[PDB]
Paper text:
Importantly, upon incubation with 3C protease, hDisp1NNN-3C was quantitatively cleaved into a larger band and two smaller bands, similar to purified hDisp1NNN; this indicates that our hDisp1NNN-3C construct is suitable for generating pure hDisp1 in either cleaved and uncleaved state. We solved the structure of uncleaved hDisp1NNN-3C at overall resolution of 3.61 Å, and the structure of hDisp1NNN-3C-cleaved at 3.68 Å. A comparison between the structures of hDisp1NNN-3C and hDisp1NNN-3C-cleaved reveals conformational shifts of the two ECDs, whereas the TMDs remain largely unchanged. After proteolytic cleavage, the two ECDs turn outwardly, away from each other, by approximately 2–3 Å, leading to a more open conformation of the extracellular surface of hDisp1. Additionally, density peaks for the C-loop in ECD1 were observed in the map of hDisp1NNN-3C-cleaved, enabling us to build 6 residues (residues 279–284) in the C-loop. The resolved C-loop is moved away from ECD2 in hDisp1NNN-3C-cleaved, suggesting that the uncleaved C-loop perhaps restricts the motions of the two ECDs, and that proteolytic cleavage allows them to move away from each other. Four N-linked glycosylation sites were identified in both hDisp1 structures, Asn363 and Asn476 on ECD1, and Asn836 and Asn917 on ECD2, which, in turn, validated sequence assignment. Similar to the sterol-like molecules seen in the reported Ptch1 cryo-EM structures, we observed several sterol-like molecules in the transmembrane domain (TMD) of both our hDisp1 structures; we assigned these molecules to the sterol detergent, cholesteryl hemisuccinate (CHS), which was used for protein purification. In contrast to other RND proteins, such as Ptch123,25,26, in which the ECDs are close together, the two ECDs in hDisp1NNN-3C and hDisp1NNN-3C-cleaved are splayed apart, exhibiting an open conformation, as previously reported for dDisp and hDisp132,33.
The membrane protein Dispatched (Disp), which belongs to the RND family of small molecule transporters, is essential for Hedgehog (Hh) signaling, by catalyzing the extracellular release of palmitate- and cholesterol-modified Hh ligands from producing cells. Also uniquely among RND proteins, Disp activity requires Furin-mediated cleavage at a conserved site in its first large extracellular domain (ECD1), yielding a mature Disp protein consisting of two non-covalently associated fragments.
Residue numbers in the entry:
A (entry chain D): 181 to 263
B (entry chain E): 279 to 389, 400 to 661, 687 to 865, 873 to 1144
């Protein structure tokens, strides 16, 4: 493309800025802007044979017992109808 | 307003006990190195009641009728005023000072009473009754640090206590930000007799964001400086402006490609720093193209512009792509770490550099060809600058590097071996040693980091707090299987889901096997006997012990029941096991788990252990390794043998440390492999490849050694820096190696001066521009900028010096026929 950037510089310098500006506009419109509130939102390993178990054991706690149909892991509750 | 009376109304009362939940300030006086004097105490209490008892505070205890005061202050001055019962802290007579001095002297040897709750009465026996209501104990355990009243110093000697503390009756929390955002941040300290050093309002992480916005003037200034320097190299302002706009647009389109095309949605913090890095990178490409342009335009000037453009592309694209792709692969190699932040920063920076290379290849020739279109002293100074630069980088530098030619070898070999020994054996880099709750995220002189690092070990109620001695528990689970579901790769930090398995506990063999497992585990060495936990252990044991009654339906059976008794009697039993003791159990109790249907789904046992909880690496590693090696002995029935291999304690810091220690090494390996491969493929001469590898190793070892000597941990940043350094090293070796080859001179001492004179200007300009673009981050507040700036300066000034001296003084041994690589 040596000849292309020889006799036609302005078209190659304008297509670039067209692409750049449409990219900037899409990137500022479509996706949700970042937060920047918690400086340590990422520092936690994932899937290392000892982080999987921690994640699962923490999910086991958040799904605790509810007075009825906890959709979770409760204690005895579901058989308290005798009273 | 906030105008009411205070608590001291000639009433010998007191609000509460000074706890850890409140807000703390730390005072040091001056070089005088003493606080026991009326000016110090009075000024301390005054700056207290001025800088914190002025702003309207609606968050308070409100235990009395005073709406703007519940406790007076909780300071040393109040505790002096309660002696001799002078109500106002302002009224001190300088004799109660001597009184409390003598009292603390005569009583400090007994430090030892917790509290005397009854008014003017002591509940338990105390050695002395001359002490007031918890005065000496509180004033020794909370307010004054350890050096005061030590038994090490002899009698008649007066201590110094260079540090004191001061509490506040309000409760620490995010609400303090306003208080801090107007009254504390601007002004230096109090007057020259008392100076605040440490603050613990508890807003160290929530306020962080703000400082970010307040410290973006240092990046901007940096950009400006770069522009200036580029004007000196290429005189046309047009090219400078267009290449800076190309860099910015590259970052923008890289963000766009990052967010929606690659489609993963999480933007970490460190990604911001990326910009700075690229500011010291992209410009380099220009300083390779433009220069070459002129050379071609100096060889065949009468030719058509198209031919010159084709020739300069032919002569520049190879090296541009080599260096850009090498740095990009060095960044992308972080995609093998298990953390999230670096696993995203890698991809982002890599895409940024690649797109920047593409734009430097396309956009830049366009603008350089479209650039076809009292001042005598202002032109003569530039002419003299050009002449001096030419005569330096053409005749002086080769002379300096080649005439000595032997001191450099020994000197740099000594530096390399010193760096190797200082990174490998004695002071090897250390893993992190601070709880995940408080990382050093500010400057190392901010009033928050002081209290969070230095002063949290001088005060008793924090040192004994460091003396926790909490054992480590082990747990076992048979209900669920370990599996992660929500976005593992390029994660979201919001992906989790629970699941189930298929096992039965009704099999009597499984019951007997669980009982045998418990009995066996009660035998090993990593066990700790308490003889106090009844239900907070194996449930089967206490269940069996509970089922010894009769005439109630089942009773008085063997151990392996027929499971129709078992499934119903578990529920029959726990509803009365809750009665005796442990009336409450909340989602972390060794009791078995149930479902919507009352069947059993998850069984969880728990035990204590003898290893104490710590933060070191070897201890926790030994614990985990040996205990998991033992637990791996299952050999059990078909059920509960699958989804069996379970073990989990409060060990997360160890996970972070292990993931760092593996990711850094894997990334280093991958990046150095790519670097050596690219150097070999671009040189086509094995001896030059060996010299380049030696230079890369030298610069890596020296920079990492200087980093560790200066004193650096591996939090999350250095885990990327250690890999970025070996990618940013070869940038100069590639250029010096390509230029050395294809030179019209066969001899050894010749053709070195050629390459050096031809590319020394470009290398020096790139080095200087990255140096000065990283040197405008040193004064700042957020830490990442300072870390990155220091690393940038220290890596560029080292890599340039090595790749010039230790390479040219080495590449002159090669023989003119050499190897020339394999035969393609
Ligand atoms: C308009 C926005 C969206 C983009 C701007 C970036 C480029 C497309 C601009 C920046 C500077 C412009 C140049 C500024 C000046 C000139 C000189 C102009 O010719 C003259 O002024 C000749 C005068 C004479 O010799 O008599 C021809 C267009 C050109 C090359 C312009 C071409 C378009 C350029 C490169
Ligand atoms: C040496 C260089 C040239 C190698 C190639 C570099 C990049 C082009 C590669 C490296 C790793 C790749 C990534 C590996 C894994 C993923 C996750 C993957 O995630 C999903 O598909 C989940 C979201 C969805 O369902 O769409 C999307 C593609 C992506 C970002 C890949 C995009 C292309 C990347 C950045
Ligand atoms: C490459 C870096 C070193 C400098 C160039 C980029 C910064 C100038 C930009 C990048 C992201 C920007 C931030 C993106 C979002 C926000 C949140 C925004 O929040 C509000 O307006 C208040 C409400 C809220 O978000 O809670 C304040 C500006 C701030 C911090 C921005 C400040 C300017 C920042 C740090
Ligand atoms: C891959 C290239 C480009 C970089 C250099 C890598 C290796 C030559 C070195 C660098 C750091 C070295 C490590 C530094 C420290 C240690 C700890 C050392 O064990 C100790 O406890 C040593 C200190 C002590 O006795 O307390 C065992 C070797 C090891 C893993 C070393 C293994 C070899 C390593 C990885
Ligand atoms: C050449 C580049 C890659 C830099 C050198 C690598 C360092 C940044 C890292 C990578 C691996 C790390 C090592 C990984 C494992 C260990 C073992 C670890 O052992 C213990 O916990 C203590 C043992 C004892 O005290 O006997 C001590 C830190 C150390 C040597 C680490 C020291 C710092 C190292 C060498
Ligand atoms: C291109 C060249 C000049 C690069 C540097 C070469 C050597 C100076 C390096 C390369 C490999 C290094 C070794 C890599 C790994 C180790 C193991 C490391 O750990 C132990 O041997 C443990 C000793 C202990 O128990 O204290 C000690 C340093 C050592 C020998 C290193 C010493 C320095 C070595 C020989
Ligand atoms: C010919 C030239 C270009 C060779 C390279 C020199 C500098 C670019 C570097 C190489 C080694 C660096 C030094 C490596 C180690 C230290 C010690 C370091 O010491 C401390 O911070 C604390 C020391 C301690 O108490 O142990 C201060 C920086 C300094 C002098 C560094 C300053 C910058 C130096 C001289
Ligand atoms: C590129 C040409 C012009 C040669 C430049 C030589 C010196 C002017 C440079 C070479 C290495 C530089 C040093 C590299 C690193 C450091 C550590 C740096 O440490 C800190 O400021 C600590 C920051 C922190 O960790 O909080 C202080 C400046 C210093 C000594 C630099 C001072 C300026 C030095 C000596
Ligand atoms: C303080 O108490 C003592 C004894 O209880 C009393 O004699 C003295 O008058 C009190 N102080 C004041 C200012 O009244
Ligand atoms: C700090 O500023 C105050 C004025 O707010 C001044 O009185 C004091 O002397 C200053 N201290 C130092 C060390 O500059
Ligand atoms: C466990 O208890 C003692 C102490 O180790 C030992 O002698 C005994 O044989 C062990 N019992 C079982 C069932 O392993
Ligand atoms: C038990 O769960 C099943 C699920 O299919 C449901 O149909 C049934 O109603 C549940 N029984 C009780 C008592 O909740």
């Amino acid at each position: 493309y040596a000849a292309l950037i020889a006799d036609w510089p302005v078209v190659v310098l304008g297509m670039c800025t067209m692409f750049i500006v449409v990219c900037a506009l899409v990137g500022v419109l479509v996706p949700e802007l970042p937060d920047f509130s918690d400086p340590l939102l990422g520092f936690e390993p994932r899937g290392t044979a000892i982080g999987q178990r921690l994640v699962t054991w923490n999910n086991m706690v958040k799904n605790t017992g509810y007075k009825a149909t906890l959709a979770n892991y409760p204690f005895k509750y579901a058989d308290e109808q005798a009273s | 307003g906030s105008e009411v009376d205070w608590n001291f109304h000639k009433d010998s009362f007191f609000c509460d006990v000074p706890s850890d939940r409140y807000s703390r300030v730390v005072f040091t006086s001056s070089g005088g190195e003493t606080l026991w004097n009326l000016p110090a105490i009075k000024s301390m209490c005054n700056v207290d009641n001025s800088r914190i008892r002025s702003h309207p505070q609606f968050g308070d205890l409100c235990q009395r009728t005073t709406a703007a005061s519940c406790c007076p202050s909780w300071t040393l001055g109040n505790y002096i005023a309660i002696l001799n019962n002078r109500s106002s802290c302002q009224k001190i007579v300088e004799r109660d000072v001597s009184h409390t001095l003598k009292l603390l002297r005569t009583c400090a040897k007994h430090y030892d009473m917790a509290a005397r709750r009854k008014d003017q009465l002591k509940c338990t026996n105390v050695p002395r009754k001359c002490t007031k209501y918890n005065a000496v104990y509180q004033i020794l355990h909370y307010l004054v640090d350890k050096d005061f009243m030590t038994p090490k110093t002899a009698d008649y000697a007066t201590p110094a206590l260079k540090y004191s503390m001061l509490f506040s009756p309000t409760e620490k929390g995010e609400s303090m930000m306003n208080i801090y955002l107007d009254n504390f941040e601007n002004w230096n300290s109090s007057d020259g007799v008392t100076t605040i050093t440490g603050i613990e309002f508890g807003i160290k992480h929530s306020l962080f964001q703000d400082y970010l916005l307040m410290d973006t003037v240092y990046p901007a200034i940096a950009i400006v400086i770069v522009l200036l320097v580029m004007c000196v190299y290429t005189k046309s302002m047009f090219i400078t402006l267009m290449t800076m706009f190309a860099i910015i647009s590259s970052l923008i389109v890289s963000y766009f490609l990052y967010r929606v095309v690659f489609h993963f949605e999480f933007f970490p913090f460190m990604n911001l720093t990326a910009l700075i890095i690229l500011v010291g990178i992209g410009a380099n490409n220009a300083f390779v193209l433009c220069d070459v342009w002129n050379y071609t335009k100096f060889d065949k000037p009468h030719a058509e512009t198209s031919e010159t453009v084709s020739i300069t592309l032919q002569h520049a694209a190879l090296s541009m792509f080599v260096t850009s792709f090498t740095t990009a692969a060095a960044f992308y190699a972080n995609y093998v770490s298990n953390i999230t932040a670096i696993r995203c920063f890698g991809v982002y920076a890599g895409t940024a550099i690649l797109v920047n290379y593409v734009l430097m290849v396309t956009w830049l020739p366009a603008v350089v060809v479209l650039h076809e279109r009292a001042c005598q002293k202002c032109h003569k100074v530039l002419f003299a600058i050009s002449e001096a630069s030419r005569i330096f980088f053409e005749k002086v530098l080769p002379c300096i590097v080649i005439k000595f030619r032997y001191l450099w070898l020994f000197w740099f070999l000594a530096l390399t071996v010193g760096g190797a020994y200082i990174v490998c054996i004695n002071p090897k880099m250390k893993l992190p040693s601070l709880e995940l709750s408080e990382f050093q995220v500010f400057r190392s002189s901010h009033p928050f980091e002081r209290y969070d690092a230095e002063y949290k070990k001088l005060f008793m109620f924090e040192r004994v707090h460091h003396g926790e001695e909490l054992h480590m528990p082990i747990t076992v689970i048979w209900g669920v299987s370990p599996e992660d579901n929500g976005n593992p790769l390029n994660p979201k930090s919001k992906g989790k889901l629970t699941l189930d398995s298929s096992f039965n506990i009704a099999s009597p063999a499984s019951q007997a096997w669980i009982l045998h497992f418990c009995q066996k585990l009660r035998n090993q060495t990593f066990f700790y006997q308490t003889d106090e936990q009844d239900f907070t252990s194996c449930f089967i044991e206490t269940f069996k012990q509970w089922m010894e009654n009769q005439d109630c339906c089942c009773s008085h059976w063997s151990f392996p029941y027929k499971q129709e008794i078992f499934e119903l009697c578990i529920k029959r039993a726990i509803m009365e096991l809750e009665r005796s003791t442990g009336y409450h159990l909340d989602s972390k109790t060794p009791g078995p788990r149930f479902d919507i249907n009352d069947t059993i789904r998850a069984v969880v046992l728990e035990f204590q252990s003898t290893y104490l909880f710590t933060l070191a690496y070897e201890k926790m590693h030994q614990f985990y390794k040996e205990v998991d090696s033992w637990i791996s002995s299952e050999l059990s029935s078909a059920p509960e043998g699958l989804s069996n291999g379970w073990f989990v304690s409060n060990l997360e810091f160890y996970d972070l440390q292990d993931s760092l220690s593996d990711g850094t090494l894997i990334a280093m390996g991958l990046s150095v492999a790519v670097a050596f491969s690219v150097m070999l493929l671009t040189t086509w001469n094995i001896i030059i490849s060996l010299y380049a590898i030696i230079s890369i190793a030298g610069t890596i070892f020296v920079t990492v050694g200087s980093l560790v000597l200066l004193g650096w941990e591996l939090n999350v940043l250095e885990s990327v820096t250690i890999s970025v350094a070996v990618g940013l090293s070869v940038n100069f070796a590639v250029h010096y190696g390509v230029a050395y080859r294809l030179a019209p001179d066969p001899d050894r001492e010749g053709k070195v001066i050629f390459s050096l004179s031809r590319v020394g200007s470009a290398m020096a300009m790139a080095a200087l521009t990255t140096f000065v673009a990283g040197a405008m981050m040193m004064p700042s507040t957020v830490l990442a900028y300072t870390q990155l700036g220091t690393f940038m300066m220290l890596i560029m000034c080292i890599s340039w010096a090595f790749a010039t001296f230790f390479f040219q003084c080495m590449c002159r041994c090669l023989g003119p026929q050499g190897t020339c690589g394999q035969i393609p």
